């Protein structure tokens, strides 16, 4: 990306579209920049998330990781990141399948 730059937190690279099978893990990733570094956010049809989950986690890198996922689990997920600077958030749906 550009190194010194002036606005909003921008995500290099957000979360996408993967059909995975219920019974796994699920990694969503998502890299943002700022300056401050933007907070990293996950939020589960419009709702704070994990926020209060054991299996579900996230890791130093804006890591979504969560394990025995759940045909109920499929939703939309939305990485925001805000920062001194601005605000943003990226678009993602986990479509979880029994037979993938």
Do not use: H, M
Not at 9 to 32: E, F, M, R, S, Y
């Amino acid at each position: 990306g550009s190194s010194g730059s002036s606005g909003p937190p921008i995500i290099l690279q957000g979360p996408a579209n993967q059909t995975l099978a219920v019974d796994g893990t699920a990694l969503l990733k998502c890299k943002a920049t700022g300056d401050p570094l933007p907070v990293i956010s996950w939020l589960k049809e419009g709702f704070t998330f994990p926020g209060r989950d054991p299996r579900a986690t996230i890791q130093e890198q804006g890591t979504l990781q969560i394990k025995n996922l759940r045909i109920s689990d499929t939703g939309t997920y939305t990485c925001v990141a805000t920062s001194s600077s601005g605000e943003t958030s990226w678009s993602a749906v986990l479509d979880v399948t029994e037979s993938g």
